[PDB]
Amino acid sequence: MLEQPYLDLAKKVLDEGHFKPDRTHTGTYSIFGHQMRFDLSKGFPLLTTKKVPFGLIKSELLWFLHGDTNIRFLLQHRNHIWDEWAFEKWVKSDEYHGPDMTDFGHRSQPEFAAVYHEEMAKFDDRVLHDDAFAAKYGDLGLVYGSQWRAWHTSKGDTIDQLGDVIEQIKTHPYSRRLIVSAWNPEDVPTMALPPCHTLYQFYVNDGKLSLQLYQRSADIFLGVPFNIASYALLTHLVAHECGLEVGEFIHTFGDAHLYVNHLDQIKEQLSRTPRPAPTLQLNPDKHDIFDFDMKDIKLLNYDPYPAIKAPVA
Amino acid sequence: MLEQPYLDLAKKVLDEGHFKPDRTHTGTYSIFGHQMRFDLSKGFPLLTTKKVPFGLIKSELLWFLHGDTNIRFLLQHRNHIWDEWAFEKWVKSDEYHGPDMTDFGHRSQPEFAAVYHEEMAKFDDRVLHDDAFAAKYGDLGLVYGSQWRAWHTSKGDTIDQLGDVIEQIKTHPYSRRLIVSAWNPEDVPTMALPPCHTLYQFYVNDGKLSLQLYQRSADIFLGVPFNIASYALLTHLVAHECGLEVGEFIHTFGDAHLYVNHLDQIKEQLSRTPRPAPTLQLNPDKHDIFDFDMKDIKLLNYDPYPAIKAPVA
Ligand SMILES: Cc1cccc2c1C(=O)N(c1cc(-c3ccccc3)ccc1O)C2=O
Ligand SMILES: Cc1cccc2c1C(=O)N(c1cc(-c3ccccc3)ccc1O)C2=O
Ligand SMILES: O=c1ccn([C@H]2C[C@H](O)[C@@H](COP(=O)(O)O)O2)c(=O)[nH]1
Ligand SMILES: O=c1ccn([C@H]2C[C@H](O)[C@@H](COP(=O)(O)O)O2)c(=O)[nH]1
């Protein structure tokens, strides 16, 4: 089945992974250096054995593809995937007054979880309808939108890294320099989250576009399914714009890990039986992906087992 | 045998690789996305089935480790691996007078090869003994020494990327952010050679340092053996400085390819039988690798079959 390599990865870290301390003081079981392939000709790698909301994937990737870094666009699609990072600079700012919000994400795991959900609703509506607030606390800064489409240069300017590589694929498809990078040595030592999706690379041979992601670290239970779909989607999108058929998505990992408190959740999922893979439908009559909207992308026959509970990693 | 994964890679591209046009107008047989592992506890991955001069590896890696970008240091060790790039800016410069040196590297493949070797001897001695010349034509600029140790920042400064990551490994060994990057989006669109060794990543779990290289494109016959040894050496060196034992070197590839005119050479080599792996000896009494000299690194029991002829890729 198309998602088997995901299920083998979970199972490999289960059986032969070693205990590794981590930055968050959860325990992990970890392996270093791993590689999965997904043949995109065969269908779309949205796990069927655990629900992954494709609406969430596509709205975030479109956020990225527009060069957007403000939570507002996500919110207008009720995509709450980055909310907690924006909240960070609201709570801790010289403009915040309210109840205690230190360790917010950490201590929300049982009575605090009630007032927290309260301030987060006040923060979301405010970002939605208060432009100056949005500008100050809604904008994430150095997230994948700027890195891909507005990369800051030593000379004061800004480089459209992904735009330029697409023209390269169009014009020199056989080039082995088709790299988009999210890793800025000037920025990583002090940034909130150095990008886990460090670098990707396009490849064209005989009508097919492929992509390989180098992911420096991977939460197997929560992150990976979402990460497979984002970058498999991007492969399709870029193929679509270049008039190419779709090849493989290759997921390469640095530290691929299972958090200690996701062990039961993973055992639950491994006893589930993969269902026929959904198929991706892209707008046949629109090709300029930076101008893509939600309706331009549709998934057919997605048939997941339910979502599985977590504690957040 | 320790080098089997190299021999399987050659054999995989032989049997299931597809013909791909390239930048140099040679033909290639190519595959996209590949991953080899070398257990460094088992011995040193210097191919025995084809001679790889370790002297050349170590002098180049020391060049890098010092932040050096001038051909002069290489030359003092009779390391001619980068000469042709420096020559480039001499021949084509507003200071060159002599016989025709256009396409120099390309047309040197039968009577031209005599006068070319002549100007290259005049260029090498000149760089060796003429400091101002050395400064103008000996210095390569944006090669791995600056990228690793003097990375230029938007604010006019220069970042010691590799120095800083070593302190990180020392101080936060379990960090999943131990990345050194050679890929600068500001520089790649106009540079002579965008680095093939795009990015590497360190990993520590239970006393062992590992490293993974993301190599964007790989000449299997000429480049790869040299590339395995460079980065396996760096793994040992960094382990040595951090007081760690050695784990795995993981070589990950974008476009791993066999040039069309290296097919016989590769078939010759596959009929050779791997010999017991050499063992690496590092100075037990010196640990600061940026202060390492040639004598600080020794290889024991290296026992290669002869070198194999080529046309240069
Ligand atoms: C990089 C970055 C930055 C901020 C915030 C998130 C991420 C991120 O990667 N994710 C994420 C969430 C889920 C998830 C899983 C179950 C339920 C809800 C969300 C799954 C995969 C993910 O990668 C973030 O929420
Ligand atoms: C990146 C870069 C830049 C300039 C110049 C060289 C390289 C390079 O990688 N090499 C190289 C040479 C040989 C080689 C093979 C047989 C004989 C002599 C040399 C093997 C592997 C190599 O990677 C360069 O010469
Ligand atoms: O898109 C993402 C973003 C984050 N992570 C996970 C990996 C790590 O568990 C954690 C990041 O922590 P560090 O690697 O930066 O330490 O989040 C993912 O898996 N995918
Ligand atoms: O250290 C190196 C440097 C270069 N190459 C090879 C790969 C390609 O065949 C060629 C570089 O050409 P491009 O990938 O930039 O097109 O040199 C290597 O294998 N290893």
XYZ file of C-alpha atoms and ligand atoms in Angstrom:
716
model
C 0.000 0.000 0.000
C 1.104 3.580 -0.756
C 1.506 4.500 2.912
C 3.329 1.342 3.910
C 6.719 3.162 4.135
C 5.183 5.420 6.815
C 4.000 2.335 8.700
C 7.448 0.656 8.328
C 9.136 3.797 9.682
C 6.940 3.858 12.826
C 7.585 0.100 13.241
C 11.415 0.494 12.710
C 11.661 3.185 15.438
C 9.463 1.014 17.618
C 11.665 -2.081 17.346
C 15.199 -0.757 16.720
C 15.084 2.922 17.826
C 17.183 4.046 20.792
C 16.167 6.315 23.675
C 17.281 9.887 23.091
C 16.843 12.931 25.329
C 15.222 15.910 23.572
C 14.848 19.753 23.713
C 11.286 19.509 25.125
C 12.117 17.052 28.008
C 9.684 14.422 26.765
C 11.543 11.158 26.047
C 11.992 10.013 22.427
C 12.882 6.794 20.650
C 15.012 7.839 17.797
C 16.805 6.835 14.585
C 19.178 8.975 12.463
C 19.134 8.837 8.662
C 16.084 7.382 6.936
C 14.501 7.460 3.492
C 10.936 6.709 2.227
C 9.653 6.918 -1.370
C 6.125 7.552 -2.561
C 5.241 6.911 -6.199
C 2.839 9.712 -6.943
C 1.564 8.028 -10.147
C -0.105 5.464 -7.836
C -2.401 7.893 -5.861
C -2.050 10.467 -3.036
C -0.072 9.782 0.209
C -2.674 11.002 2.720
C -2.631 8.339 5.440
C -5.853 6.357 5.480
C -4.999 4.674 8.832
C -5.196 7.996 10.652
C -7.206 10.959 9.593
C -5.187 13.887 8.229
C -7.376 16.922 7.391
C -6.391 17.802 3.816
C -8.133 21.182 4.137
C -5.500 22.051 6.717
C -2.621 20.855 4.506
C -3.769 22.825 1.450
C -4.538 26.114 3.216
C -1.116 26.137 4.928
C 0.708 25.280 1.651
C -1.157 28.081 -0.097
C -0.184 30.436 2.770
C 3.464 29.448 1.992
C 3.009 29.710 -1.795
C 1.759 33.327 -1.475
C 4.785 34.375 0.676
C 2.444 34.995 3.563
C 3.663 34.887 7.174
C 0.597 36.301 8.991
C -1.702 33.952 10.971
C -4.703 35.904 9.614
C -4.980 34.016 6.329
C -4.799 30.681 8.211
C -7.512 31.874 10.606
C -9.850 32.847 7.712
C -9.721 29.145 6.831
C -10.024 28.103 10.447
C -6.499 26.677 10.292
C -5.158 26.849 13.831
C -1.823 25.088 13.111
C 0.439 28.133 13.855
C -1.673 30.020 16.395
C 0.509 29.175 19.423
C 3.609 30.812 17.923
C 1.809 34.108 17.311
C 0.296 33.962 20.798
C 3.887 33.669 22.133
C 4.658 37.287 21.167
C 1.290 38.553 22.444
C 1.496 36.993 25.943
C 5.156 37.963 26.470
C 4.905 41.428 24.827
C 4.936 44.865 26.477
C 1.287 45.209 25.333
C -0.190 42.156 27.134
C -2.357 42.443 30.223
C -4.394 39.453 31.475
C -4.081 36.135 33.388
C -0.761 34.180 33.504
C 0.311 32.816 30.100
C 3.872 31.601 30.804
C 4.496 27.985 29.718
C 1.057 28.336 28.076
C 1.385 25.383 25.687
C 3.163 23.269 28.287
C 0.812 23.677 31.274
C -2.379 23.455 29.150
C -1.934 19.665 29.457
C -6.123 20.693 33.162
C -7.942 23.651 34.713
C -5.613 26.202 33.035
C -6.844 24.790 29.710
C -10.132 26.688 30.257
C -8.794 30.271 30.567
C -6.158 29.565 27.912
C -8.807 28.690 25.323
C -10.341 31.976 26.395
C -7.364 34.241 25.654
C -6.695 32.354 22.409
C -10.229 33.208 21.175
C -9.641 36.872 22.049
C -6.312 36.708 20.202
C -7.754 35.080 17.058
C -10.725 37.448 16.619
C -8.457 40.407 17.318
C -5.949 39.294 14.611
C -8.896 38.717 12.235
C -10.385 42.242 12.669
C -7.631 44.465 14.061
C -5.060 45.166 11.311
C -2.441 46.879 13.513
C -2.650 43.997 16.001
C -2.470 41.476 13.135
C 0.657 43.272 11.888
C 2.373 43.118 15.313
C 1.282 39.715 16.671
C -0.222 37.893 13.694
C 2.947 38.003 11.563
C 5.324 35.107 12.251
C 8.351 36.518 10.376
C 10.911 33.895 9.396
C 8.528 31.072 8.459
C 8.352 29.132 5.181
C 6.636 31.909 3.201
C 9.487 34.357 3.515
C 12.192 31.715 3.113
C 10.671 30.270 -0.126
C 9.466 33.550 -1.751
C 11.137 36.570 -0.018
C 14.604 35.472 1.131
C 16.516 38.374 2.651
C 19.866 39.184 1.015
C 23.068 40.714 2.442
C 22.492 43.673 0.161
C 19.107 44.702 1.737
C 16.890 43.029 -0.905
C 14.699 39.896 -0.967
C 14.928 36.819 -3.249
C 12.046 34.773 -4.675
C 13.833 31.466 -4.284
C 10.900 29.150 -5.264
C 9.671 31.362 -8.134
C 13.175 31.271 -9.674
C 13.630 27.465 -9.357
C 10.254 26.921 -11.142
C 11.573 28.980 -14.116
C 14.756 26.902 -13.974
C 12.769 23.620 -14.146
C 10.817 25.127 -17.039
C 13.959 26.247 -18.839
C 16.661 23.769 -17.643
C 14.626 20.746 -16.434
C 17.758 18.520 -16.275
C 19.610 20.855 -13.909
C 20.901 19.273 -10.676
C 20.841 22.633 -8.885
C 17.021 22.889 -8.410
C 17.231 23.510 -4.656
C 14.952 25.482 -2.387
C 16.405 26.089 1.054
C 14.773 27.191 4.300
C 18.006 27.185 6.365
C 19.590 30.550 7.044
C 22.868 30.363 9.081
C 22.444 34.050 9.956
C 18.978 33.380 11.462
C 18.964 29.895 12.936
C 20.913 30.663 16.173
C 18.198 32.916 17.583
C 15.035 31.929 15.759
C 11.996 30.476 17.461
C 12.013 27.336 15.317
C 14.850 26.671 12.925
C 12.956 25.053 9.988
C 12.535 21.268 10.282
C 11.984 21.240 6.538
C 15.490 22.333 5.876
C 15.852 21.924 2.152
C 14.166 20.340 -0.866
C 15.252 19.398 -4.387
C 13.452 18.955 -7.703
C 14.351 16.445 -10.424
C 13.136 15.905 -13.981
C 13.742 12.873 -16.052
C 11.476 11.762 -18.928
C 8.382 13.822 -18.346
C 8.229 13.350 -14.573
C 8.902 15.815 -11.742
C 10.150 14.396 -8.426
C 10.995 16.072 -5.155
C 13.175 15.092 -2.193
C 12.805 16.732 1.227
C 15.603 16.793 3.766
C 13.741 16.978 7.084
C 16.238 17.595 9.936
C 13.893 16.258 12.615
C 10.564 14.474 12.470
C 7.882 13.853 15.032
C 6.679 10.513 13.600
C 3.244 10.400 15.259
C 2.069 14.066 14.763
C 4.354 15.726 12.232
C 5.259 13.228 9.530
C 1.752 12.478 8.041
C 1.100 16.198 7.664
C 4.672 16.673 6.242
C 4.286 13.916 3.630
C 1.080 15.439 2.300
C 2.396 19.084 2.237
C 5.451 18.169 0.135
C 3.681 15.558 -1.997
C 1.153 18.330 -2.693
C 3.926 20.759 -3.654
C 5.327 18.108 -6.037
C 1.954 17.888 -7.847
C 1.551 21.701 -7.890
C 5.003 22.348 -9.410
C 4.530 19.484 -11.907
C 1.189 21.053 -12.807
C 2.672 24.520 -13.477
C 5.568 23.022 -15.543
C 3.317 20.723 -17.623
C 5.016 17.619 -16.281
C 3.775 14.330 -14.960
C 4.391 13.397 -11.347
C 7.228 11.142 -10.187
C 8.253 10.295 -6.677
C 8.218 12.149 -3.389
C 11.275 11.157 -1.387
C 11.214 11.915 2.291
C 14.694 11.933 3.846
C 15.116 12.275 7.637
C 17.773 13.423 10.052
C 16.377 12.594 13.500
C 13.173 10.656 12.835
C 11.670 10.055 16.308
C 8.690 8.705 18.266
C 7.872 10.801 21.343
C 7.669 8.697 24.490
C 4.028 9.667 25.062
C 2.894 8.614 21.543
C 3.737 4.935 21.921
C 0.204 3.653 22.546
C -1.176 5.851 19.763
C 1.298 4.363 17.331
C 0.534 0.730 18.434
C -3.174 1.487 17.957
C -2.532 2.687 14.376
C -0.290 -0.224 13.303
C -3.290 -2.563 13.852
C -5.278 -0.569 11.273
C -5.372 -1.756 7.630
C -4.511 0.772 4.871
C -7.327 1.659 2.459
C -7.013 2.371 -1.296
C -5.171 5.692 -1.760
C -7.129 8.879 -2.555
C -6.449 10.574 -5.914
C -5.444 14.177 -6.424
C -7.356 16.480 -8.752
C -5.781 19.724 -9.890
C -7.523 22.502 -11.867
C -6.877 21.503 -15.474
C -7.422 25.080 -16.681
C -5.283 27.004 -14.254
C -1.534 26.473 -14.000
C 0.060 29.421 -12.138
C 0.243 27.981 -8.639
C 1.012 31.245 -6.838
C -2.497 32.236 -7.977
C -4.071 29.009 -6.698
C -7.074 29.057 -4.384
C -8.579 26.244 -2.229
C -11.032 25.177 -4.970
C -8.181 24.654 -7.400
C -7.099 21.549 -5.383
C -9.372 18.521 -4.690
C -8.878 15.093 -3.141
C -11.101 12.216 -4.258
C -11.975 9.033 -2.336
C -10.287 9.903 0.996
C -11.415 7.343 3.504
C -9.501 7.560 6.819
C -9.906 5.705 10.050
C -10.687 8.162 12.859
C -8.183 10.653 14.380
C -6.201 9.369 17.368
C -5.776 11.290 20.627
C -2.446 12.790 21.675
C -0.545 14.785 24.143
C 1.070 17.557 22.075
C 4.750 16.819 21.485
C 32.349 -5.441 3.238
C 32.419 -1.800 4.399
C 32.393 -0.407 0.861
C 29.684 -2.699 -0.442
C 27.047 0.112 -0.408
C 29.264 2.047 -2.854
C 29.445 -1.029 -5.084
C 25.638 -1.563 -4.836
C 25.052 2.078 -5.809
C 27.211 1.784 -8.967
C 25.419 -1.509 -9.777
C 21.901 0.014 -9.139
C 22.566 2.925 -11.553
C 24.004 0.422 -13.994
C 20.932 -1.829 -14.022
C 17.987 0.467 -13.193
C 19.277 4.019 -13.894
C 17.694 6.064 -16.683
C 19.426 8.195 -19.319
C 19.487 11.850 -18.330
C 20.903 14.825 -20.231
C 23.350 16.930 -18.189
C 24.922 20.449 -17.918
C 28.248 19.248 -19.410
C 26.736 17.508 -22.528
C 28.191 14.125 -21.622
C 25.384 11.557 -21.231
C 24.532 10.226 -17.750
C 22.639 7.280 -16.318
C 20.899 8.627 -13.332
C 18.824 7.897 -10.216
C 17.210 10.433 -7.832
C 17.142 9.875 -4.070
C 19.545 7.353 -2.567
C 21.010 6.552 0.837
C 24.133 4.579 1.949
C 25.352 3.980 5.524
C 28.878 3.333 6.715
C 29.449 2.054 10.245
C 32.600 3.854 11.246
C 33.221 1.516 14.225
C 34.035 -1.176 11.620
C 37.016 0.603 9.880
C 37.545 3.447 7.359
C 35.510 3.780 4.095
C 38.408 4.381 1.685
C 37.575 2.181 -1.308
C 40.006 -0.700 -1.620
C 38.723 -1.652 -5.120
C 39.992 1.615 -6.570
C 42.816 3.657 -5.231
C 41.801 6.906 -3.521
C 44.821 8.984 -2.396
C 44.102 9.736 1.270
C 46.828 12.407 1.288
C 44.650 14.338 -1.135
C 41.502 13.880 0.983
C 43.159 15.041 4.215
C 44.958 18.090 2.804
C 41.749 19.379 1.166
C 39.690 18.791 4.362
C 42.314 20.652 6.371
C 42.185 23.491 3.795
C 38.399 23.627 4.525
C 38.846 23.319 8.310
C 41.180 26.368 8.363
C 38.678 28.545 6.394
C 41.146 28.705 3.550
C 40.020 29.380 -0.029
C 43.406 29.943 -1.736
C 44.881 27.218 -4.000
C 48.320 27.963 -2.492
C 47.928 25.738 0.562
C 46.737 22.857 -1.668
C 49.729 23.385 -3.967
C 52.203 23.248 -1.025
C 50.896 19.704 -0.551
C 50.919 19.020 -4.264
C 47.122 18.772 -4.202
C 45.967 19.743 -7.677
C 42.234 19.058 -7.094
C 41.063 22.724 -7.462
C 43.707 24.112 -9.818
C 41.424 24.334 -12.881
C 38.974 26.692 -11.157
C 41.712 29.164 -10.223
C 43.163 28.929 -13.731
C 39.687 29.931 -15.026
C 40.082 33.480 -13.658
C 43.699 33.749 -14.850
C 43.073 32.725 -18.493
C 39.917 34.852 -18.847
C 41.220 37.860 -16.841
C 42.305 41.289 -18.106
C 45.855 40.336 -16.997
C 46.324 37.188 -19.145
C 48.525 37.110 -22.222
C 49.535 33.785 -23.828
C 48.225 30.964 -26.085
C 44.459 30.183 -26.354
C 42.951 28.866 -23.101
C 39.202 28.922 -23.870
C 37.448 25.593 -23.172
C 40.793 24.658 -21.563
C 39.506 21.719 -19.505
C 37.198 20.571 -22.288
C 39.611 20.538 -25.253
C 42.530 19.089 -23.223
C 40.916 15.691 -23.933
C 45.280 15.740 -27.577
C 47.967 18.122 -28.829
C 46.534 21.080 -26.843
C 47.197 18.998 -23.713
C 50.925 19.808 -24.109
C 50.793 23.642 -24.003
C 48.023 23.519 -21.395
C 50.213 21.577 -18.963
C 52.725 24.306 -19.699
C 50.603 27.301 -18.662
C 49.315 25.380 -15.631
C 52.916 24.934 -14.374
C 53.531 28.669 -14.833
C 50.288 29.364 -12.957
C 51.086 27.032 -10.035
C 54.645 28.279 -9.392
C 53.440 31.860 -9.726
C 50.662 31.308 -7.112
C 53.233 29.575 -4.865
C 55.766 32.475 -4.939
C 53.881 35.591 -6.032
C 51.614 36.765 -3.177
C 49.710 39.446 -5.133
C 49.042 36.935 -7.923
C 48.024 34.303 -5.345
C 45.603 36.847 -3.856
C 43.987 37.617 -7.246
C 43.971 34.213 -8.985
C 44.769 31.697 -6.252
C 41.760 32.569 -4.065
C 38.603 30.666 -5.023
C 36.144 32.747 -2.952
C 32.869 30.977 -2.217
C 34.222 27.462 -1.636
C 33.719 25.220 1.408
C 36.188 27.080 3.648
C 34.263 30.322 3.653
C 30.854 28.643 3.812
C 31.784 26.448 6.848
C 33.934 28.981 8.799
C 33.333 32.544 7.434
C 29.718 32.730 6.234
C 28.847 36.235 5.073
C 25.896 37.878 6.847
C 23.368 40.486 5.652
C 24.808 42.846 8.231
C 28.372 42.918 6.716
C 29.900 40.353 9.121
C 30.988 36.701 8.803
C 29.759 33.625 10.740
C 31.821 30.631 11.883
C 29.088 28.121 11.166
C 31.122 24.905 11.836
C 32.936 26.289 14.908
C 29.555 27.143 16.491
C 27.927 23.733 15.770
C 30.926 21.960 17.425
C 30.273 23.994 20.629
C 26.600 23.056 20.317
C 27.445 19.316 20.096
C 29.722 19.805 23.100
C 27.062 21.657 25.067
C 23.738 20.305 23.657
C 24.736 16.945 22.090
C 21.063 15.853 21.745
C 20.086 18.896 19.680
C 18.419 18.164 16.318
C 19.569 21.508 14.902
C 23.282 20.595 14.391
C 23.345 21.655 10.730
C 26.171 23.040 8.649
C 25.044 24.446 5.321
C 26.998 25.323 2.186
C 23.966 26.563 0.190
C 23.539 30.309 -0.090
C 20.405 31.390 -2.077
C 21.987 34.827 -2.553
C 25.091 33.264 -4.185
C 24.030 30.135 -6.029
C 22.480 31.827 -9.128
C 25.792 33.247 -10.332
C 28.449 31.118 -8.683
C 30.903 28.975 -10.586
C 29.858 25.787 -8.797
C 26.913 25.796 -6.442
C 28.147 23.353 -3.733
C 27.357 19.685 -4.443
C 27.804 19.077 -0.736
C 24.812 21.141 0.103
C 24.273 20.465 3.767
C 25.319 18.112 6.564
C 23.929 17.183 9.980
C 25.437 15.836 13.196
C 23.744 13.458 15.643
C 24.663 12.178 19.098
C 23.094 9.286 20.837
C 24.842 7.211 23.535
C 28.438 8.238 23.126
C 28.501 8.155 19.322
C 28.690 10.999 16.788
C 27.118 10.417 13.360
C 26.903 12.620 10.307
C 24.577 12.707 7.294
C 25.508 14.508 4.067
C 22.918 15.726 1.600
C 24.801 15.673 -1.711
C 22.677 17.354 -4.434
C 24.527 15.645 -7.284
C 27.119 12.897 -7.393
C 29.513 11.743 -10.055
C 29.574 8.059 -9.016
C 32.826 7.048 -10.739
C 35.089 10.078 -9.867
C 33.401 12.089 -7.131
C 31.706 9.726 -4.701
C 34.770 7.750 -3.365
C 36.557 11.009 -2.596
C 33.292 12.430 -1.068
C 32.742 9.425 1.221
C 36.242 9.703 2.653
C 36.143 13.548 3.135
C 32.918 13.421 5.179
C 33.735 10.169 6.982
C 36.997 11.908 7.930
C 35.116 14.968 9.200
C 32.908 12.653 11.304
C 36.006 11.183 13.019
C 37.592 14.645 13.470
C 34.494 16.180 15.113
C 33.994 13.059 17.274
C 37.644 13.385 18.280
C 37.319 17.049 19.350
C 34.062 16.326 21.291
C 35.435 13.221 23.069
C 32.867 10.979 21.427
C 33.028 7.630 19.735
C 32.213 7.338 16.053
C 28.830 6.236 14.704
C 27.653 6.144 11.142
C 28.330 8.237 8.074
C 25.152 8.486 6.031
C 25.515 9.582 2.457
C 22.246 10.867 0.975
C 22.021 11.735 -2.748
C 19.905 13.920 -4.977
C 21.029 13.072 -8.519
C 23.445 10.161 -8.125
C 24.742 9.498 -11.669
C 27.177 7.497 -13.815
C 28.671 9.549 -16.660
C 28.254 7.845 -20.020
C 32.024 7.671 -20.547
C 32.705 5.938 -17.185
C 30.750 2.777 -17.946
C 33.708 0.521 -18.769
C 35.662 1.854 -15.788
C 32.802 0.968 -13.489
C 32.399 -2.577 -14.994
C 36.147 -3.087 -14.504
C 35.854 -2.143 -10.802
C 32.789 -4.295 -10.013
C 34.905 -7.388 -10.867
C 37.376 -6.417 -8.122
C 37.025 -7.961 -4.632
C 36.958 -5.608 -1.599
C 39.867 -5.923 0.845
C 39.728 -5.562 4.660
C 39.020 -1.900 5.515
C 41.870 0.399 6.618
C 41.701 1.845 10.153
C 41.877 5.503 11.070
C 44.377 6.817 13.601
C 43.887 10.248 15.113
C 46.382 12.102 17.349
C 45.390 10.971 20.837
C 47.015 14.039 22.417
C 45.637 16.793 20.251
C 41.917 17.504 20.007
C 41.369 20.988 18.506
C 40.802 20.070 14.876
C 41.136 23.585 13.454
C 44.758 23.287 14.632
C 45.255 19.888 12.981
C 48.159 19.236 10.634
C 48.736 16.344 8.159
C 50.678 14.265 10.723
C 47.765 14.408 13.132
C 45.794 12.043 10.808
C 47.006 8.546 9.750
C 45.483 5.640 7.846
C 46.662 2.104 8.603
C 46.521 -0.963 6.332
C 45.253 0.753 3.144
C 45.559 -1.743 0.353
C 43.871 -0.574 -2.884
C 43.726 -2.098 -6.305
C 45.292 0.277 -8.843
C 43.731 3.581 -10.039
C 41.498 3.322 -13.114
C 41.760 5.622 -16.137
C 39.092 8.202 -16.955
C 37.963 10.951 -19.158
C 37.269 13.849 -16.772
C 33.535 14.251 -16.201
C 6.149 23.682 11.984
C 4.980 24.029 12.869
C 4.951 25.269 13.492
C 3.882 25.629 14.304
C 2.833 24.755 14.544
C 2.860 23.517 13.925
C 3.922 23.152 13.096
C 3.548 21.784 12.667
O 4.282 21.084 11.879
N 2.371 21.423 13.199
C 1.745 20.234 13.042
C 0.549 19.907 13.718
C -0.102 18.675 13.590
C -1.378 18.299 14.269
C -1.576 16.968 14.659
C -2.762 16.574 15.274
C -3.767 17.516 15.494
C -3.584 18.841 15.095
C -2.396 19.235 14.477
C 0.444 17.726 12.759
C 1.613 17.996 12.086
C 2.245 19.210 12.224
O 3.393 19.344 11.498
C 1.961 22.447 13.964
O 0.864 22.483 14.647
C 34.207 20.128 -5.986
C 35.442 20.182 -6.848
C 35.872 21.410 -7.333
C 37.013 21.500 -8.120
C 37.738 20.371 -8.472
C 37.310 19.145 -7.991
C 36.173 19.046 -7.188
C 36.088 17.592 -6.918
O 35.156 17.078 -6.197
N 37.099 16.938 -7.507
C 37.315 15.602 -7.491
C 38.358 14.990 -8.219
C 38.584 13.609 -8.237
C 39.688 12.925 -8.977
C 39.462 11.651 -9.512
C 40.474 10.972 -10.188
C 41.728 11.566 -10.321
C 41.967 12.830 -9.778
C 40.953 13.509 -9.099
C 37.752 12.796 -7.506
C 36.716 13.347 -6.787
C 36.503 14.706 -6.780
O 35.443 15.115 -6.024
C 37.825 17.857 -8.163
O 38.890 17.619 -8.857
O 6.784 20.455 10.462
C 7.231 19.938 11.494
C 7.637 20.754 12.556
C 8.118 20.175 13.737
N 8.219 18.808 13.836
C 8.680 18.223 15.105
C 10.029 17.529 15.112
C 10.440 17.743 16.556
O 9.828 16.765 17.375
C 9.856 19.087 16.923
C 10.858 20.190 16.599
O 11.815 20.292 17.631
P 13.371 20.485 17.286
O 13.769 19.465 16.294
O 13.597 21.868 16.714
O 14.231 20.235 18.492
O 8.716 19.237 16.094
C 7.802 17.993 12.785
O 7.875 16.771 12.885
N 7.325 18.548 11.608
O 32.558 17.121 -4.814
C 31.990 16.888 -5.887
C 31.881 17.900 -6.847
C 31.263 17.635 -8.076
N 30.737 16.389 -8.320
C 30.137 16.122 -9.637
C 28.638 15.895 -9.696
C 28.342 16.383 -11.101
O 28.628 15.357 -12.032
C 29.327 17.506 -11.329
C 28.719 18.826 -10.870
O 27.862 19.337 -11.867
P 26.440 19.973 -11.476
O 25.723 19.030 -10.594
O 26.653 21.286 -10.753
O 25.566 20.140 -12.687
O 30.441 17.197 -10.510
C 30.856 15.375 -7.372
O 30.403 14.257 -7.603
N 31.463 15.620 -6.150
